[PDB]
């Protein structure tokens, strides 16, 4: 008695959303209901397409009188399994009420039943030694065409659960409720505007509705079209309602829609704020104060990021896909780490040397269904979904199997990646940076000739032999890191000295090095073929080693100050341990 | 958490599907924002659209205590939903919302809390707040498209180093009153800074608060009056070293004499090879002094020479002198390319996924240890 | 085992997440630490704060026995936490904490002991002592990031030769009484 709700009464009081369009799907359902046998329409489709809307829109249309007179004034009853199954502890209680409702339905003979998520009726009332389940009770009536029922199940819930029972499946007519077109969704939201407008006390513009459907389709890819557009519109209205803290109430424009879509998709907001605009302005200069030289690399990264924020990005490709090649000890992997720091975005580091085996791909995208590692998922796919705006660093890419380079293809060409669970990872806002050492032996090696030669080109041919043409044709740029110059080394030495001072400050110790001494360190450690790494070893032997012996046992146990100067006659550094 | 909180309010004031889901990693503070939404309401620092609203945290275990009888769970669960719908002001906060996908299912039936609540959420009569980890949401929650479609995912990221310092500052009175201690400003900064560097298996807000609560208990346990009622920076460093199983920042007096005589002791055991002993001792001294590599090992040496000259012996005797574990790894067994799996485990979906990597597991078990890769060239 | 017990007591006095987790190899004494704190309390060799407290050893089999009906496990487990919460001087000791991940899950039954104890540990109302092996901590316990965050890992190290001989001498009376033989000091070494 209180288990079924009359949708006609609910539709007449304005409680059911209006059904816009879907005339083809509506006629198919109505045509099925007018059959003699197997006249039960089953609306099957993805979630958010509008299945429940059509099942409820039928009663809405019947009230308005626009439906064919063959079934005019029919009463659609929406059955909620929760109320029916509740309070049926006693034996035969669930069957008494369920059979009572069916008896009433047959007596009327001009009423249709709607069971949302009808897959749930399988085993609804069953129990240990169960007398009968709801599915079996309805089977006689459905076979004899006595009563007509309307079902609604998703595709996932129509195969594993509903297709199993062939008997019930045969008495239903599957209807593929496909998602509407982009143009059709705009019409749907136009008719629904008054309801949402009255709730939030806001008005939506024509362009705003169109921009929502368009922006949602190209950014939101985890929801269907009639479910995400309404979310953008609904969320925009609530923001507009709460925004007038000082009574600053106005019409909802396209700008408001863009902002809500950004938060839902976690993409950078359009119309970047002045605070963020300043970060990109001096990003190159800020990076140049931590990574000296290699200006071409910093420029490509900064320009790629700017274009994506300014709107002139790629359609369905990452912000940038750069292959940082060059000798060792240069700022290949350092500039990438510093970029994530300045931008304040999460750094996704992936040491590609652990993927030497061709079957390690299962770790990146997860194990297929039916295996032990299916639950774990993929590291790369999950990491991207967690942090859509990040910097994906693939270090030592050339040290991985040639089959790990085929995954990145779709990442660069389509901006997507499908894990084992079928989820799509979005790489449209990730700064893909891959560092390699392809042809490093060649650069170290010298030519057999009177005139030495540049091996930068020799390392390029190796790249071509490792990476296929298709892989190299989708990279925004291939940047070559030139060897560190002498002038650069002086800046690099100061950088390492600054790091030393920070470590000393934590102990209450200070250090001062003159430019005369700093120059001496550069000559001893400078090696064009080994980059800047040797500079950290010279500092360790000349500055950290003497200081360590003093800190543990000496004048710096409880703080102090040091002065480092060189002796010209002996060309050796002098360490002064002032105490404190 | 103004930005994260504001998004939740916007979703709550929606017409339909007004259920703000809070996804994030463990310890980020998902439950803090839900429970905190009520703390703000009592003070009144919230918009008037949500003012006077009530929040009710759901305990799934208590609800399923006495529902053995058929249609016993559905009856009480439906009663709660009726109360929320008729109240028109309360909010249901279902922590660990990924558990309602199989709640109250006895037989092979798909009738559960998720199916029961689904129609109400699609109508916007009730407002529900969820909380789920990233793995749980992606593996259990997101598998139900219908239920996922009724919730508005709100990703929350761990705060910045500066931001988490303010969080601890606000929590200081609660923790200070429990342990009857006072936390210095430097201590809170050191906890955040030191936990980020060493503790790499937890998140910043929770892990930083774990160092502050652990240190407070230690101080109270100590009987000395001067240290009690106060928490210095040195206390925080000891606690972090304990949790991370690493040497303390400040070198102990016992370890200061060991490092001083580490070279002489090794020389007596293994004569000659003064250069090798000096490199190991100097690197260790720098690491304990604190002016070591920011993110690189204490030392990565490559001993090369003839046979029987002391390469393995000096390394084996370094662990004994320092009283640490020795991770002996014979690289001859890794001659083949495919042997790498042993070091880092097999990939997912294979026979050896469960075993794990020998090197990674050994290092995790013994972080402070000497790793000896003998006959690496053979590999 | 003074340092191990000291850290365990420090964790048990925390305002929140006061749940010491004893992780170690197979043979190392982990249950003894949890089951030795009880012996210390009765003898009186424990801080004043940890005095007048009883350690309860939870058995999974007894808790999951005869619970075929829906909600029988939930009732038993909720009653235990209720009685343990109103005590405020009781510590629950689970010998194998890796076994609560799928204790009650029947069919996609995420409602289990692992998901039911989380609100209690986060609120700091109860105290729980755990114990598990490395092989089972990393592959079972560490998978549940939320549950592992409410437990403070306390690594246990194999005792030295000098430490082990003292342990043998402490257990010598009970072992001597069983076999009715007296082990010489040289024999223990």
């Amino acid at each position: 008695e209180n288990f079924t709700t009359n949708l006609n009464q609910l539709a007449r009081v304005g409680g059911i959303d209006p059904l816009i369009g879907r005339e083809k799907e509506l006629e198919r359902a109505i045509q099925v209901l007018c059959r003699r046998r197997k006249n039960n329409p089953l609306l099957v489709g993805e979630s958010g397409v509008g299945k429940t809307a059509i099942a409820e829109g039928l009663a809405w249309r019947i009230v308005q009188g626009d439906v064919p007179e063959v079934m005019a004034d029919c009463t659609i009853y929406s059955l909620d399994i929760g109320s029916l199954l509740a309070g049926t502890k006693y034996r035969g209680d669930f069957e008494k009420r369920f059979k009572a409702l069916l008896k009433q339905l047959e007596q009327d003979t001009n009423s249709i039943l709607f069971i949302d998520e009808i897959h749930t009726i399988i085993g609804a009332g069953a129990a240990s030694g169960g007398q009968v389940d709801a599915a079996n009770l309805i089977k006689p009536l459905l076979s004899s065409g006595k009563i007509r029922v309307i079902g609604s199940t998703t595709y996932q819930e129509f195969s594993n659960i509903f297709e199993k029972d062939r008997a019930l499946a045969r008495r239903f007519q599957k209807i593929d409720i496909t998602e509407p077109s982009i143009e059709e969704t705009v019409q749907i939201i136009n008719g629904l505007k008054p309801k949402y407008e009255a709730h939030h006390d806001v008005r939506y513009t024509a362009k705003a509705v169109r921009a929502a459907v368009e922006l949602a389709v190209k950014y939101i890819n985890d929801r269907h079209l009639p479910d995400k557009a309404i979310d953008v519109i609904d969320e925009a209205g609530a923001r507009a309602r709460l925004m007038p803290v000082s009574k600053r109430k106005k019409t909802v424009n396209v700008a408001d829609i863009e902002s809500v879509v950004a938060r839902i998709a976690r993409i950078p907001e359009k119309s970047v704020s002045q605070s963020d605009r300043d970060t990109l302005k001096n990003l190159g200069d800020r990076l140049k104060m931590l990574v000296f030289g290699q200006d071409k690399a910093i420029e490509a990264l900064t320009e790629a990021i700017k274009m994506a924020r300014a709107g002139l990005g790629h359609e369905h490709k990452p912000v940038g896909s750069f292959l940082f090649a060059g000798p060792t000890g240069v700022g290949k992997t350092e500039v990438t780490v510093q970029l994530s720091k300045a931008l304040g975005i999460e750094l996704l580091r992936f040491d590609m040397s652990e993927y030497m085996e061709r079957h390690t791909v299962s770790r990146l995208i997860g194990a297929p269904p039916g295996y032990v590692g299916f639950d774990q998922g993929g590291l790369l796919t999950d990491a991207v979904i967690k942090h859509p705006h990040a910097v994906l660093l693939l270090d030592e890419i050339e040290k991985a199997h040639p089959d790990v380079f085929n995954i990145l293809l779709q990442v660069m060409d389509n901006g997507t990646l499908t894990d084992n669970n079928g989820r799509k990872a979005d790489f449209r806002n990730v700064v893909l940076v891959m560092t390699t050492n392809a042809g490093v032996r060649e650069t170290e090696r010298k030519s057999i000739g009177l005139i030495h030669q540049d091996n930068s080109t020799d390392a390029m041919e190796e790249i071509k032999k490792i990476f296929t043409p298709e892989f190299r044709n989708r990279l925004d740029n291939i940047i070559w890191f030139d060897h560190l110059s002498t002038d650069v080394i002086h800046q690099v030495v100061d950088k390492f000295i600054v790091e030393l001072q920070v470590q000393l400050d934590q102990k209450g110790v200070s250090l001062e090095v003159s430019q005369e001494a700093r120059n001496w360190l550069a000559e001893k450690g400078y090696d064009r073929a080994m980059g800047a790494r040797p500079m950290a070893r010279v500092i360790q032997d000349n500055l950290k080693k003497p200081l360590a012996n003093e800190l543990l046992f000496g004048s710096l146990v409880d703080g102090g100050q040091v002065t480092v100067a060189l002796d010209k006659e002996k060309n050796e550094l002098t360490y002064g341990f002032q105490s404190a | 958490r103004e930005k994260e909180l504001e998004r939740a309010i916007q979703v709550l004031c929606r017409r339909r599907k007004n259920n703000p889901l809070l996804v994030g990693e463990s310890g980020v503070g998902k439950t803090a924002i839900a429970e905190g939404l009520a703390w703000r309401i009592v003070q009144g620092d919230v918009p008037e659209v949500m003012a006077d609203c009530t929040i009710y945290s759901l305990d799934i275990g208590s609800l399923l205590a006495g529902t053995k009888y058929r249609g016993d769970f559905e009856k009480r669960f439906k009663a709660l939903l009726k109360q929320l719908e008729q109240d028109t002001n309360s909010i249901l906060f279902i922590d660990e919302i990924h558990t309602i996908i199989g709640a109250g299912a006895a037989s092979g039936g798909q009738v559960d809390a998720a199916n029961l609540i689904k129609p109400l959420l699609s109508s916007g009569k009730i407002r529900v707040i969820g909380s789920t980890t990233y793995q749980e949401f992606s593996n259990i929650f997101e598998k139900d498209r219908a239920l996922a479609r009724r919730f508005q995912k709100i990703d929350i990221t761990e705060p910045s180093i500066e931001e988490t310092v303010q969080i601890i500052n606000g929590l200081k009175p609660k923790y200070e009153a429990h342990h009857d201690v006072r936390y210095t400003a430097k201590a809170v900064r050191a906890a955040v800074e030191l936990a980020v560097k060493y503790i790499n298996d937890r998140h910043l807000p929770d892990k930083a608060i774990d160092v502050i609560d652990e240190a407070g208990a230690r101080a109270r346990l100590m009987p000395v009056s001067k240290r009690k009622k106060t928490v210095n920076v040195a206390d925080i460093e000891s606690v972090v070293a304990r949790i991370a199983r690493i040497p303390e920042k400040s070198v102990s007096q016992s370890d200061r004499d060991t490092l001083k005589n580490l070279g002489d002791r090794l020389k007596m055991l293994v004569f000659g090879q003064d250069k090798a002993i000096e490199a190991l001792t100097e690197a260790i001294k720098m690491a304990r002094a604190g002016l070591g590599h920011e993110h690189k090992p204490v030392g990565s040496f490559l001993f090369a020479g003839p046979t029987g000259v002391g390469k393995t012996e000096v390394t084996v005797q370094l662990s004994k002198a320092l009283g640490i574990e020795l991770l002996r790894f014979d690289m001859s067994e890794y001659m083949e390319r495919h042997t790498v799996s042993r070091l880092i485990g097999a990939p997912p979906g294979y026979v050896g996924f469960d075993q794990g990597g020998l090197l990674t597991d050994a290092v995790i078990k013994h972080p402070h240890a000497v790793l000896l890769l003998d006959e690496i060239e053979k590999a | 085992r003074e340092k191990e017990l000291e850290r365990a007591i420090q964790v048990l006095c925390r305002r929140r997440k006061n749940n010491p987790l004893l992780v170690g190899e197979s043979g190392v004494g982990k249950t003894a630490i949890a089951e030795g704190l009880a012996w210390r309390i009765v003898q009186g060799d424990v801080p004043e704060v940890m005095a007048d407290c009883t350690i309860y050893s939870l058995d999974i089999g007894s808790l999951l026995a005869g619970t075929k009906y829906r909600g029988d496990f939930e009732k038993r487990f909720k009653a235990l936490l209720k009685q343990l919460e109103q005590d405020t001087n009781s510590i629950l000791f689970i010998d194998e904490i890796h076994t609560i991940i799928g204790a009650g899950a029947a069919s996609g039954g995420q409602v289990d002991a692992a998901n039911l104890i989380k609100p209690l540990l986060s609120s700091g109302k109860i105290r729980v002592i755990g114990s598990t092996t490395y092989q089972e901590f990393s592959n079972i316990f560490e998978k549940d990031r939320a549950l592992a965050r409410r437990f403070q890992k306390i690594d246990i190290t194999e005792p030295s030769i000098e430490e082990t001989v003292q342990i043998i001498n402490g257990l010598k009376p009970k072992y001597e009484a069983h076999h009715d033989v007296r082990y010489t000091a040289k024999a223990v070494r």
């Binding site: 049926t88 502890k89 006693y90 034996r91 209680d93 129990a127 240990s128 079957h359 039916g370 295996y371 032990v372 299916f374 | 529902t67 053995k68 009888y69 058929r70 016993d72 006895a106 037989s107 092979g108 083949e336 495919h338 979906g349 294979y350 026979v351 996924f353 | 075929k68 009906y69 829906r70 899950a105 029947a106 069919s107 996609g108 039954g109």
Partner: peptide, 25 residues
Amino acid sequence: GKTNDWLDFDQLAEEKVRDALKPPS
């Protein structure tokens, strides 16, 4: 030379069941 084969490991799904009883009277 030779090809190093890889053996995948399958996982099976087994789920327990509970019975909600109905009093006879």
